[PDB]
Amino acid sequence: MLRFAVLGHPVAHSLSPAMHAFALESLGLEGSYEAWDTPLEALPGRLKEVRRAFRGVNLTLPLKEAALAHLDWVSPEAQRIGAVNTVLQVEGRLFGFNTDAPGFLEALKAGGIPLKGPALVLGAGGAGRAVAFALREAGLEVWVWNRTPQRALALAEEFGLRAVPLEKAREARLLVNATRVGLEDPSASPLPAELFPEEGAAVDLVYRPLWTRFLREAKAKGLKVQTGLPMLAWQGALAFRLWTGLLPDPSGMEEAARRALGV
Amino acid sequence: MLRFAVLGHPVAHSLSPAMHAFALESLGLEGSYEAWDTPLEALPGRLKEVRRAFRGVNLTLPLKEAALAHLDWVSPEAQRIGAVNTVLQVEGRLFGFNTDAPGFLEALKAGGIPLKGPALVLGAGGAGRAVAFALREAGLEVWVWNRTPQRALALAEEFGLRAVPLEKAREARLLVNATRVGLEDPSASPLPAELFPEEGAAVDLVYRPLWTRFLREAKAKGLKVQTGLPMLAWQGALAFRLWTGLLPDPSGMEEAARRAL
Ligand SMILES: NC(=O)c1ccc[n+]([C@@H]2O[C@H](COP(=O)([O-])OP(=O)(O)OC[C@H]3O[C@@H](n4cnc5c(N)ncnc54)[C@H](OP(=O)(O)O)[C@@H]3O)[C@@H](O)[C@H]2O)c1
Ligand SMILES: O=C(O)C1=C[C@@H](O)[C@@H](O)[C@H](O)C1
Ligand SMILES: O=C(O)C1=C[C@@H](O)[C@@H](O)[C@H](O)C1
């Protein structure tokens, strides 16, 4: 039967096991998706076990960047972003992909959030990289900001983006929180309410809590908003299709995640 | 939502659509597998389409060899054999594999055919190369013959095997017809009756007719025989697993192919 897993440290609170349990069941497929606690020092030994016992696996912190080297093939996008979140095993060979980028795009689209820019991504980290990448290829003008200017400006040239000051947020039509600000902090938001734009949309990758201060403020300002669950659901559905050729219902996966969160 | 197909020319009488319709059904999956006529020249474009609406495809004559120069990745085995018969599509990328080689070995095992050599592969073409590759991997002493001596000599040095005269067949214990001799021609066989050994086994990749002159000669000599259907079924099943992660019943697929005949 189909054997899947999410590798990373920690993974005790990953919502993937629950989402893919729904995927397997709803598709009438026999298999399992487990969470394998895997530190970076155990990545090599774990990948070798993947080559022989798993059809595929997702990768989470802190294995997304240190995985490319141990795989037999890495997709272009995954090479540029410099991160792999989805691994496929066929004939003992491992192939690396990044479903976060496309997952993000499909979530916005399916969520009614127009890909009308300029889009501003807060955070020049791994999360920001994937998002910055996706918005570009989508056909939007994209700016990037980072708590630390260094990072931002460097990411702007690599991808060919524009590192702007936080104030520029007011001129953006798409705002994306790619920082860990607000994570389990209902009182925190990386962007002062006064810097929010008139019209546009806001997406927060943080889903704990679901309605972050960022989103609450964005909504009050009248912007379209989307939580972090839709992206989580699509990157997972896209990963399942990549492994089997079958796309589980993204809405159903988000719902499964929702239930696992208890909110 | 699983869209598959066999690319090649001709493919009008391919048994793959039947075998795979069974695989899908038997596995409670929804999908399709069609025969898609494709000439050498129409390949470069056909693959672009595959990238857009196909999860995977099988390639047959005369696309197997040319397909390599139009794929994102090719397996080490497919590379060495020099041919791809199975393509997987993910994120618009194309990966090439060869299930003919592993399929042949699985067919022999499932069919009760002992892996005992020397093995003589007749034909140094694409099918012969896949079979030779498989037999070499299995550790048997492999000999190869080809109507055109050069092709066999090149393959022998290339794979570290031995090119032999057709007469050495009397000393082989496993004989495999990987030539097109006998294809829809009951009067033709690649090996003269008198050159068959009196002990061993024979397998014919040609399955039209099912009981080729070659297999009838082998059977008449007392050799254990296997038709081309088990291999056709196993290469198909293995390809289906490459595409979905699921392995359909090879016996069931062979049965489906038999009926399609
Ligand atoms: N059962 C299965 O699943 C399966 C899988 C693969 C292939 N096959 C079958 O096995 C055959 C091999 O296919 P392929 O891709 O290798 O290419 P092909 O074009 O079908 O066959 C090429 C081979 O046949 C030889 N040949 C042709 N005419 C000959 C003749 N009159 N006398 C002696 N040898 C002759 C060639 O030798 P020269 O170098 O002298 O031309 C070469 O070795 C096909 O007929 C195919 O239908 C079956
Ligand atoms: O929490 C999880 O299980 C995941 C989180 C994201 O990083 C995804 O990119 C990953 O594929 C799975
Ligand atoms: O006739 C067919 O449909 C096929 C013939 C062989 O070349 C196989 O290698 C191919 O995958 C399917």
Side-chain angles (χ1 to χ4, degrees), chain A residues 55-73:
Chain A
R55 168 66 179 185
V57 298
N58 277 131
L59 294 182
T60 338
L61 312 174
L63 316 173
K64 291 197 178 180
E65 295 203 323
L68 288 68
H70 300 319
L71 305 185
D72 309 308
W73 183 92

PDB file of all heavy atoms in Angstrom, chain A residues 55-73:
ATOM      1  N   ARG A  55       6.629   5.903  -0.888  1.00  0.00           N
ATOM      2  CA  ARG A  55       6.306   6.364  -2.230  1.00  0.00           C
ATOM      3  C   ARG A  55       6.654   7.852  -2.280  1.00  0.00           C
ATOM      4  O   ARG A  55       7.115   8.373  -3.303  1.00  0.00           O
ATOM      5  CB  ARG A  55       4.809   6.170  -2.511  1.00  0.00           C
ATOM      6  CG  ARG A  55       4.311   6.873  -3.767  1.00  0.00           C
ATOM      7  CD  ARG A  55       4.911   6.289  -5.048  1.00  0.00           C
ATOM      8  NE  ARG A  55       4.392   6.977  -6.233  1.00  0.00           N
ATOM      9  CZ  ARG A  55       4.653   6.631  -7.491  1.00  0.00           C
ATOM     10  NH1 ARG A  55       5.436   5.590  -7.750  1.00  0.00           N
ATOM     11  NH2 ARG A  55       4.122   7.325  -8.493  1.00  0.00           N
ATOM     12  N   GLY A  56       6.430   8.532  -1.160  1.00  0.00           N
ATOM     13  CA  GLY A  56       6.728   9.952  -1.091  1.00  0.00           C
ATOM     14  C   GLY A  56       6.692  10.505   0.319  1.00  0.00           C
ATOM     15  O   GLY A  56       6.206   9.855   1.251  1.00  0.00           O
ATOM     16  N   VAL A  57       7.227  11.708   0.480  1.00  0.00           N
ATOM     17  CA  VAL A  57       7.245  12.364   1.781  1.00  0.00           C
ATOM     18  C   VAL A  57       7.316  13.870   1.631  1.00  0.00           C
ATOM     19  O   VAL A  57       7.766  14.394   0.607  1.00  0.00           O
ATOM     20  CB  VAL A  57       8.465  11.930   2.673  1.00  0.00           C
ATOM     21  CG1 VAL A  57       8.416  10.438   2.973  1.00  0.00           C
ATOM     22  CG2 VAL A  57       9.774  12.299   1.994  1.00  0.00           C
ATOM     23  N   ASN A  58       6.843  14.561   2.662  1.00  0.00           N
ATOM     24  CA  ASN A  58       6.904  16.009   2.691  1.00  0.00           C
ATOM     25  C   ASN A  58       8.064  16.331   3.608  1.00  0.00           C
ATOM     26  O   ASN A  58       8.425  15.529   4.468  1.00  0.00           O
ATOM     27  CB  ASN A  58       5.621  16.606   3.266  1.00  0.00           C
ATOM     28  CG  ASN A  58       4.522  16.718   2.231  1.00  0.00           C
ATOM     29  OD1 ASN A  58       3.396  16.300   2.471  1.00  0.00           O
ATOM     30  ND2 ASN A  58       4.844  17.294   1.075  1.00  0.00           N
ATOM     31  N   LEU A  59       8.666  17.493   3.411  1.00  0.00           N
ATOM     32  CA  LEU A  59       9.777  17.896   4.251  1.00  0.00           C
ATOM     33  C   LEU A  59       9.443  19.223   4.911  1.00  0.00           C
ATOM     34  O   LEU A  59       8.938  20.133   4.261  1.00  0.00           O
ATOM     35  CB  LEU A  59      11.055  18.035   3.421  1.00  0.00           C
ATOM     36  CG  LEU A  59      11.637  16.766   2.792  1.00  0.00           C
ATOM     37  CD1 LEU A  59      12.920  17.142   2.061  1.00  0.00           C
ATOM     38  CD2 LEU A  59      11.915  15.705   3.849  1.00  0.00           C
ATOM     39  N   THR A  60       9.710  19.314   6.209  1.00  0.00           N
ATOM     40  CA  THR A  60       9.460  20.538   6.954  1.00  0.00           C
ATOM     41  C   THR A  60      10.761  20.962   7.625  1.00  0.00           C
ATOM     42  O   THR A  60      11.785  20.285   7.502  1.00  0.00           O
ATOM     43  CB  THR A  60       8.401  20.340   8.054  1.00  0.00           C
ATOM     44  OG1 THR A  60       7.584  19.205   7.744  1.00  0.00           O
ATOM     45  CG2 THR A  60       7.514  21.582   8.150  1.00  0.00           C
ATOM     46  N   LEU A  61      10.720  22.082   8.335  1.00  0.00           N
ATOM     47  CA  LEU A  61      11.902  22.572   9.029  1.00  0.00           C
ATOM     48  C   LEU A  61      12.425  21.443   9.907  1.00  0.00           C
ATOM     49  O   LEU A  61      11.648  20.727  10.537  1.00  0.00           O
ATOM     50  CB  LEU A  61      11.538  23.783   9.897  1.00  0.00           C
ATOM     51  CG  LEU A  61      10.700  24.853   9.189  1.00  0.00           C
ATOM     52  CD1 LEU A  61      10.264  25.925  10.184  1.00  0.00           C
ATOM     53  CD2 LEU A  61      11.500  25.455   8.044  1.00  0.00           C
ATOM     54  N   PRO A  62      13.752  21.263   9.957  1.00  0.00           N
ATOM     55  CA  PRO A  62      14.764  22.048   9.244  1.00  0.00           C
ATOM     56  C   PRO A  62      15.437  21.223   8.145  1.00  0.00           C
ATOM     57  O   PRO A  62      16.666  21.162   8.078  1.00  0.00           O
ATOM     58  CB  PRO A  62      15.738  22.389  10.348  1.00  0.00           C
ATOM     59  CG  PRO A  62      15.817  21.058  11.075  1.00  0.00           C
ATOM     60  CD  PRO A  62      14.367  20.542  11.087  1.00  0.00           C
ATOM     61  N   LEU A  63      14.636  20.598   7.283  1.00  0.00           N
ATOM     62  CA  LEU A  63      15.185  19.757   6.224  1.00  0.00           C
ATOM     63  C   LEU A  63      14.944  20.248   4.800  1.00  0.00           C
ATOM     64  O   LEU A  63      15.409  19.623   3.847  1.00  0.00           O
ATOM     65  CB  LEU A  63      14.612  18.346   6.345  1.00  0.00           C
ATOM     66  CG  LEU A  63      14.532  17.727   7.740  1.00  0.00           C
ATOM     67  CD1 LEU A  63      13.777  16.417   7.652  1.00  0.00           C
ATOM     68  CD2 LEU A  63      15.925  17.512   8.315  1.00  0.00           C
ATOM     69  N   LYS A  64      14.228  21.356   4.646  1.00  0.00           N
ATOM     70  CA  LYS A  64      13.916  21.871   3.315  1.00  0.00           C
ATOM     71  C   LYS A  64      15.095  22.292   2.442  1.00  0.00           C
ATOM     72  O   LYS A  64      15.062  22.110   1.226  1.00  0.00           O
ATOM     73  CB  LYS A  64      12.924  23.034   3.409  1.00  0.00           C
ATOM     74  CG  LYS A  64      11.528  22.629   3.842  1.00  0.00           C
ATOM     75  CD  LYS A  64      10.529  23.725   3.503  1.00  0.00           C
ATOM     76  CE  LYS A  64       9.108  23.335   3.885  1.00  0.00           C
ATOM     77  NZ  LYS A  64       8.133  24.416   3.548  1.00  0.00           N
ATOM     78  N   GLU A  65      16.131  22.858   3.046  1.00  0.00           N
ATOM     79  CA  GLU A  65      17.285  23.306   2.264  1.00  0.00           C
ATOM     80  C   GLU A  65      18.377  22.231   2.160  1.00  0.00           C
ATOM     81  O   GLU A  65      19.022  22.060   1.133  1.00  0.00           O
ATOM     82  CB  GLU A  65      17.853  24.561   2.929  1.00  0.00           C
ATOM     83  CG  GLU A  65      16.876  25.737   2.885  1.00  0.00           C
ATOM     84  CD  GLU A  65      17.646  27.032   3.018  1.00  0.00           C
ATOM     85  OE1 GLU A  65      18.613  27.064   3.766  1.00  0.00           O
ATOM     86  OE2 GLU A  65      17.267  28.004   2.368  1.00  0.00           O
ATOM     87  N   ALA A  66      18.606  21.490   3.240  1.00  0.00           N
ATOM     88  CA  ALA A  66      19.643  20.459   3.258  1.00  0.00           C
ATOM     89  C   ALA A  66      19.225  19.150   2.593  1.00  0.00           C
ATOM     90  O   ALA A  66      19.891  18.126   2.754  1.00  0.00           O
ATOM     91  CB  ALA A  66      20.076  20.189   4.692  1.00  0.00           C
ATOM     92  N   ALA A  67      18.130  19.174   1.844  1.00  0.00           N
ATOM     93  CA  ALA A  67      17.666  17.960   1.186  1.00  0.00           C
ATOM     94  C   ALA A  67      18.104  17.876  -0.274  1.00  0.00           C
ATOM     95  O   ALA A  67      18.391  16.790  -0.778  1.00  0.00           O
ATOM     96  CB  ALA A  67      16.141  17.865   1.284  1.00  0.00           C
ATOM     97  N   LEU A  68      18.162  19.024  -0.944  1.00  0.00           N
ATOM     98  CA  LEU A  68      18.542  19.072  -2.351  1.00  0.00           C
ATOM     99  C   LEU A  68      19.773  18.249  -2.715  1.00  0.00           C
ATOM    100  O   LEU A  68      19.794  17.584  -3.750  1.00  0.00           O
ATOM    101  CB  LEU A  68      18.764  20.519  -2.797  1.00  0.00           C
ATOM    102  CG  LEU A  68      17.529  21.411  -2.941  1.00  0.00           C
ATOM    103  CD1 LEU A  68      16.917  21.690  -1.575  1.00  0.00           C
ATOM    104  CD2 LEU A  68      17.928  22.710  -3.621  1.00  0.00           C
ATOM    105  N   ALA A  69      20.793  18.289  -1.865  1.00  0.00           N
ATOM    106  CA  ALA A  69      22.027  17.557  -2.130  1.00  0.00           C
ATOM    107  C   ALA A  69      21.890  16.039  -2.121  1.00  0.00           C
ATOM    108  O   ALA A  69      22.546  15.345  -2.894  1.00  0.00           O
ATOM    109  CB  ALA A  69      23.107  17.983  -1.142  1.00  0.00           C
ATOM    110  N   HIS A  70      21.032  15.523  -1.252  1.00  0.00           N
ATOM    111  CA  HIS A  70      20.848  14.085  -1.146  1.00  0.00           C
ATOM    112  C   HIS A  70      19.839  13.461  -2.100  1.00  0.00           C
ATOM    113  O   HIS A  70      19.596  12.257  -2.046  1.00  0.00           O
ATOM    114  CB  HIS A  70      20.461  13.709   0.284  1.00  0.00           C
ATOM    115  CG  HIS A  70      21.481  14.094   1.312  1.00  0.00           C
ATOM    116  ND1 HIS A  70      22.836  13.949   1.107  1.00  0.00           N
ATOM    117  CD2 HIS A  70      21.342  14.560   2.577  1.00  0.00           C
ATOM    118  CE1 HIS A  70      23.488  14.304   2.199  1.00  0.00           C
ATOM    119  NE2 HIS A  70      22.605  14.678   3.107  1.00  0.00           N
ATOM    120  N   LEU A  71      19.251  14.268  -2.972  1.00  0.00           N
ATOM    121  CA  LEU A  71      18.266  13.762  -3.924  1.00  0.00           C
ATOM    122  C   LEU A  71      18.874  13.555  -5.304  1.00  0.00           C
ATOM    123  O   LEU A  71      19.858  14.203  -5.665  1.00  0.00           O
ATOM    124  CB  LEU A  71      17.072  14.721  -4.009  1.00  0.00           C
ATOM    125  CG  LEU A  71      16.392  15.039  -2.677  1.00  0.00           C
ATOM    126  CD1 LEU A  71      15.161  15.897  -2.946  1.00  0.00           C
ATOM    127  CD2 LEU A  71      16.011  13.763  -1.946  1.00  0.00           C
ATOM    128  N   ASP A  72      18.276  12.659  -6.081  1.00  0.00           N
ATOM    129  CA  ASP A  72      18.788  12.367  -7.410  1.00  0.00           C
ATOM    130  C   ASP A  72      18.396  13.421  -8.435  1.00  0.00           C
ATOM    131  O   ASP A  72      19.059  13.574  -9.459  1.00  0.00           O
ATOM    132  CB  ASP A  72      18.297  10.989  -7.860  1.00  0.00           C
ATOM    133  CG  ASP A  72      18.573   9.911  -6.826  1.00  0.00           C
ATOM    134  OD1 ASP A  72      19.737   9.791  -6.389  1.00  0.00           O
ATOM    135  OD2 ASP A  72      17.632   9.187  -6.447  1.00  0.00           O
ATOM    136  N   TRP A  73      17.325  14.157  -8.155  1.00  0.00           N
ATOM    137  CA  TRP A  73      16.853  15.187  -9.074  1.00  0.00           C
ATOM    138  C   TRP A  73      16.023  16.225  -8.322  1.00  0.00           C
ATOM    139  O   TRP A  73      15.165  15.873  -7.512  1.00  0.00           O
ATOM    140  CB  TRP A  73      16.000  14.544 -10.169  1.00  0.00           C
ATOM    141  CG  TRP A  73      15.525  15.492 -11.222  1.00  0.00           C
ATOM    142  CD1 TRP A  73      16.147  15.785 -12.401  1.00  0.00           C
ATOM    143  CD2 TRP A  73      14.324  16.276 -11.197  1.00  0.00           C
ATOM    144  NE1 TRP A  73      15.409  16.696 -13.114  1.00  0.00           N
ATOM    145  CE2 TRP A  73      14.285  17.018 -12.398  1.00  0.00           C
ATOM    146  CE3 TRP A  73      13.275  16.426 -10.274  1.00  0.00           C
ATOM    147  CZ2 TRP A  73      13.238  17.898 -12.705  1.00  0.00           C
ATOM    148  CZ3 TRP A  73      12.230  17.305 -10.581  1.00  0.00           C
ATOM    149  CH2 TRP A  73      12.224  18.027 -11.786  1.00  0.00           C
TER     150      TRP A  73
END
